Design an enzyme around this catalytic site. Structure first.
Site, PDB file in Angstrom:
ATOM      1  N   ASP A 110      -6.176  38.720 -88.904  1.00  0.00           N
ATOM      2  CA  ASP A 110      -6.323  38.650 -87.565  1.00  0.00           C
ATOM      3  C   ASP A 110      -7.085  37.559 -86.738  1.00  0.00           C
ATOM      4  OD1 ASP A 110      -7.638  39.415 -84.909  1.00  0.00           O
ATOM      5  OD2 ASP A 110      -9.102  40.914 -85.416  1.00  0.00           O
ATOM      6  N   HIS A 150     -23.434  39.989 -78.456  1.00  0.00           N
ATOM      7  CA  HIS A 150     -22.411  40.752 -77.872  1.00  0.00           C
ATOM      8  C   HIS A 150     -22.553  42.333 -77.889  1.00  0.00           C
ATOM      9  CE1 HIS A 150     -20.562  37.217 -76.499  1.00  0.00           C
ATOM     10  NE2 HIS A 150     -20.190  36.874 -77.871  1.00  0.00           N
ATOM     11  N   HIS A 197     -20.616  31.715 -75.415  1.00  0.00           N
ATOM     12  CA  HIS A 197     -20.107  33.025 -75.069  1.00  0.00           C
ATOM     13  C   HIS A 197     -21.196  33.706 -74.032  1.00  0.00           C
ATOM     14  CE1 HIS A 197     -17.252  32.070 -78.266  1.00  0.00           C
ATOM     15  NE2 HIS A 197     -16.329  32.512 -77.398  1.00  0.00           N
ATOM     16  N   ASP A 205     -21.450  27.293 -81.152  1.00  0.00           N
ATOM     17  CA  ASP A 205     -20.106  27.102 -80.754  1.00  0.00           C
ATOM     18  C   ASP A 205     -20.196  26.397 -79.358  1.00  0.00           C
ATOM     19  OD1 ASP A 205     -21.182  29.232 -79.572  1.00  0.00           O
ATOM     20  OD2 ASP A 205     -19.779  30.815 -80.042  1.00  0.00           O
ATOM     21  N   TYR A 245     -18.759  27.680 -85.062  1.00  0.00           N
ATOM     22  CA  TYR A 245     -17.751  27.742 -86.222  1.00  0.00           C
ATOM     23  C   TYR A 245     -16.909  26.595 -86.698  1.00  0.00           C
ATOM     24  CZ  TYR A 245     -18.237  32.326 -83.763  1.00  0.00           C
ATOM     25  OH  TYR A 245     -18.932  33.442 -83.551  1.00  0.00           O
ATOM     26  N   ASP A 294     -25.646  29.967 -76.886  1.00  0.00           N
ATOM     27  CA  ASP A 294     -24.281  30.252 -77.180  1.00  0.00           C
ATOM     28  C   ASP A 294     -23.134  29.845 -76.324  1.00  0.00           C
ATOM     29  OD1 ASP A 294     -22.953  32.172 -79.931  1.00  0.00           O
ATOM     30  OD2 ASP A 294     -21.650  32.296 -78.123  1.00  0.00           O
TER      31      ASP A 294
HETATM   32  C1  LIG Z   1     -13.624  34.575 -80.649  1.00  0.00           C
HETATM   33  N1  LIG Z   1     -13.811  35.970 -80.030  1.00  0.00           N
HETATM   34  C2  LIG Z   1     -15.247  35.950 -79.347  1.00  0.00           C
HETATM   35  C3  LIG Z   1     -16.265  35.096 -80.053  1.00  0.00           C
HETATM   36  C4  LIG Z   1     -17.682  35.405 -80.376  1.00  0.00           C
HETATM   37  C5  LIG Z   1     -18.600  34.509 -80.344  1.00  0.00           C
HETATM   38  O1  LIG Z   1     -18.425  33.288 -80.696  1.00  0.00           O
HETATM   39  N2  LIG Z   1     -19.803  34.911 -79.766  1.00  0.00           N
HETATM   40  O2  LIG Z   1     -21.076  34.080 -79.475  1.00  0.00           O
HETATM   41  C6  LIG Z   1     -12.762  35.849 -79.032  1.00  0.00           C
HETATM   42  C7  LIG Z   1     -13.029  34.901 -77.923  1.00  0.00           C
HETATM   43  N3  LIG Z   1     -12.197  33.736 -78.161  1.00  0.00           N
HETATM   44  C8  LIG Z   1     -11.320  33.209 -77.352  1.00  0.00           C
HETATM   45  O3  LIG Z   1     -10.776  33.868 -76.699  1.00  0.00           O
HETATM   46  C9  LIG Z   1     -10.514  31.944 -77.853  1.00  0.00           C
HETATM   47  C10 LIG Z   1      -9.113  31.821 -78.082  1.00  0.00           C
HETATM   48  C11 LIG Z   1      -8.641  30.580 -78.349  1.00  0.00           C
HETATM   49  C12 LIG Z   1      -9.256  29.444 -77.985  1.00  0.00           C
HETATM   50  C13 LIG Z   1     -10.699  29.532 -77.829  1.00  0.00           C
HETATM   51  C14 LIG Z   1     -11.150  30.584 -77.331  1.00  0.00           C
HETATM   52  K   LIG Z   2     -24.522  32.131 -73.993  1.00  0.00           K
HETATM   53 NA    NA Z   3      -8.801  44.142 -82.479  1.00  0.00          NA
HETATM   54 ZN   LIG Z   4     -20.228  32.504 -79.085  1.00  0.00          ZN
END
Ligand SMILES: CN(CCCC(=O)NO)CCNC(=O)c1ccccc1
Ligand SMILES: [K+]
Ligand code: NA
Ligand SMILES: [Zn+2]
Ligand SMILES: [K+]
Length: 639
Positions: free
Chosen positions: A22, A137, A176, A267, A307, A174
């Site tokens: 994945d 999240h 995100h 990140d 990461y 963060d």
């Molecule tokens: C990884 N996952 C959530 C991360 C959770 C987190 O770190 N939360 O703090 C999905 C989102 N990441 C992307 O869509 C993506 C794809 C390609 C290149 C850059 C970004």
């Molecule tokens: K944040």
């Molecule tokens: Na999934």
């Molecule tokens: Zn994050």
């Protein structure tokens, strides 16, 4: 009072991982945890921390933020084989499960509650939990974005319930958006949630309309949710500090939280494949430091994402370094935020103008990949050196100390025959002390900062500044509380003078910032606005090699000197020299305490700043923001 920094960690949280292909999840690895702890060990930081053990969160604690139906469902995953664990994972977005993840989620949550307890019981000043899985999240009835349970949401609810706190700040740096945290406190005004996040006009995961700057909370919680969307990647140190100086900190100090909890995802640092930003690991040393004067320093840092295994360890180290009170690294190359960042900052300030003091004037139109390694941050052998009047014995913290050489003696003789004539052997003694403390600060790396009580300003200032410039100190930031003129030339770019005074002066060059504040109950909130929104942006851009604090004998701002002394140690590796004119044991004890790294007592509520003072401050911004772009909190109009 409390001392020490907690480091809550356990290798067991590295004992779950992704069991199938994945690419969405494969960046979230056990090594994230082992790499950060080993980095703390390599650099001697884990050894300086009070280790507190993890515990499981209890069922009643999980139910503070999650539904019984979702707990019961997660509680069944330890008995699942891989096929069943994949099928369960697909019911959610960007999350995977493992025989052991339920066990570790309760450990990540319990680890967080352990850190809250140690901080709120004053067994430590502050601390950090290195945990997996992340939490921000995760939602009442859903796992999301590698998150199973919402560790930081628990910390806030637990601290409300078991310590009766009314005001908790959550900073989520963060990259995100922590929508799980937003949802949990949307209608709650006792928890103020700030998040910055990669958004790119909602094209970036989690692709949510309510992650935009217009989501300010609901009902009684309106104004207690602050989203700062990043709509381009590549944000730099200057963007992050612009966000703090002109959005987060003005609200944070006015809110006056009783506890601060950081959702600490790295990140958002350079090199991370998810965030794609350009902020250096050193910035986290300052994000940490900028918040430590809140809630008497009671800060709980909780690991979320991050990461790039190299950017990760470096950024964890910079954060703990600052938690331990080590000197902050100098940030060079700072300037204006990029246009997209200024647009985002502009928009959130305007929408939040309904709810917050610092932005209130913006509403009525009568007003309107490789990078260099972080260098070593060693704590100075004795942090602070104090020189009270001769004969005045004082009780100092364990990291402070009193004061001359033969070389220092000849230098004062040399200085005297050339420039000053002067015979008072008391003034001549302060000059000998100034030189010697500076020599210990600038050359030894054994002493960090200091304070010297002085009799005459004009000779001791001139002597401190000139001697500092040959240490060498390429640049000297001078902060002067007092009226009149100082023997300080600001013509050649080596010196920036901040002057807090009482009589409105003439705006001279662009290397002076003068703040004449109207006396009254307004002076404290007025001063803190100027500090966060004017003094700190310029100082950070100026990047001095030494800070020279100066206070005239003419008490009125006994209440803010501690915060400034604390915040201004973000500059110049903490190398500050404070000249206090005349003995005042209260101001001298406060200066020494803040200088030595002691916890700063909160300001509490303050009468909103005077409109004339806000108007004065915005005239200074207009006058200086073209040279000092870090002052900008709007997009510039083009010709
Ligand atoms: C990884 N996952 C959530 C991360 C959770 C987190 O770190 N939360 O703090 C999905 C989102 N990441 C992307 O869509 C993506 C794809 C390609 C290149 C850059 C970004
Ligand atoms: K944040
Ligand atoms: Na999934
Ligand atoms: Zn994050
Ligand atoms: K809230």
């Amino acid at each position: 009072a409390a001392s020490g920094s907690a480091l809550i960690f356990d290798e067991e949280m590295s004992r779950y991982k992704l069991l199938w292909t994945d690419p969405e999840c494969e960046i979230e690895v056990p090594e994230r945890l082992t790499v950060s702890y080993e980095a703390l060990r390599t650099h001697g930081l884990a050894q300086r921390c009070k280790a507190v053990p993890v515990r499981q969160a209890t069922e009643q604690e999980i139910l503070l933020a999650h539904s019984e139906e979702y707990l019961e469902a997660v509680k069944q995953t330890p008995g699942m084989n891989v096929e069943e664990l994949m099928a369960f994972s697909k019911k959610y977005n960007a999350v995977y499960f493992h025989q052991n993840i339920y066990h570790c989620a309760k450990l990540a949550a319990g680890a967080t509650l352990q850190l809250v307890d140690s901080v709120m019981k004053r067994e430590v000043r502050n601390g950090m939990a290195l945990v997996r899985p992340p939490g921000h999240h995760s939602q009442r009835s859903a796992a999301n974005g590698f998150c199973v349970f919402n560790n930081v949401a628990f910390a806030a609810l637990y601290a409300k319930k078991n310590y009766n706190l009314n005001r908790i700040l959550i900073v989520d740096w963060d990259v995100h958006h922590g929508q799980g945290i937003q949802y949990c406190f949307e209608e709650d005004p006792s928890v103020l949630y700030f998040s910055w996040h990669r958004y790119e006009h909602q094209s970036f995961w989690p692709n949510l309309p309510e992650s935009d700057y217009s989501s300010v909370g609901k009902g009684k919680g309106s104004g207690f949710n602050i989203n700062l969307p990043w709509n381009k990647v590549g944000m730099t140190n200057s963007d992050y500090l612009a966000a703090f100086f002109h959005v987060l900190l003005p609200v944070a100090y006015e809110f006056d939280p009783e506890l601060v909890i950081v959702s600490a995802g790295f990140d958002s640092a350079i090199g991370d494949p998810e965030g794609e930003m350009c902020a250096l690991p050193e910035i986290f040393a300052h994000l940490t430091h900028l918040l430590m004067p809140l809630a008497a320093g009671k800060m709980c840092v909780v690991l979320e994402g991050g990461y790039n295994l190299t950017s990760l360890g470096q950024s964890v180290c910079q954060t703990v370094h600052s938690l331990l009170g080590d000197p902050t690294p100098r940030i060079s190359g700072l300037g204006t935020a990029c246009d997209s960042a200024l647009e985002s900052i502009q928009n959130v300030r305007n929408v939040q103008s309904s709810y917050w003091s610092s932005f209130k004037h913006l509403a009525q139109s009568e007003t309107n990949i490789v990078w260099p390694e972080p260098l070593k941050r060693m704590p100075a052998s004795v942090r602070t050196v104090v020189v009270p009047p001769p004969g005045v014995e004082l009780t100092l913290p364990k990291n402070c100390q009193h004061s001359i050489s033969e070389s220092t003696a000849k230098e004062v003789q040399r200085i005297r025959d050339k420039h000053f004539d002067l015979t008072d052997q008391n003034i001549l003694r302060s000059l000998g002390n100034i030189i010697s403390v500076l020599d210990r600060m600038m050359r030894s790396d054994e002493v960090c900062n200091g304070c010297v009580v002085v009799s005459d300003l004009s000779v001791s200032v001139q002597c401190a500044l000139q001697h500092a410039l040959t240490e060498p100190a390429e640049r000297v930031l001078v902060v002067y509380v007092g009226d009149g003129e100082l023997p300080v030339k600001t013509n050649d770019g080596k010196v920036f003078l901040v002057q807090i005074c009482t009589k409105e002066t003439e705006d001279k060059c662009v290397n002076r910032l003068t703040l004449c504040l109207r006396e009254g109950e307004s002076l404290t909130a007025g001063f803190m606005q100027a500090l966060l929104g004017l003094i700190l942006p310029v100082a950070y851009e100026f990047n001095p090699a030494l800070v020279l604090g100066i206070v005239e004998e003419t008490t009125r701002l006994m209440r803010v000197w501690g915060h400034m002394t604390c915040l201004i140690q973000g500059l110049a590796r903490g190398r500050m020299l404070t000249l206090l004119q005349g003995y005042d044991k209260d101001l001298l004890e406060l200066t020494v305490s803040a200088l030595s790294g002691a916890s700063i007592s909160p300001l509490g509520p303050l009468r909103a700043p005077k409109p004339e003072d806000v108007e004065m401050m915005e005239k200074q911004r207009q006058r200086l923001q073209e040279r000092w772009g870090l002052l900008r909190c709007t997009v510039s109009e083009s010709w």
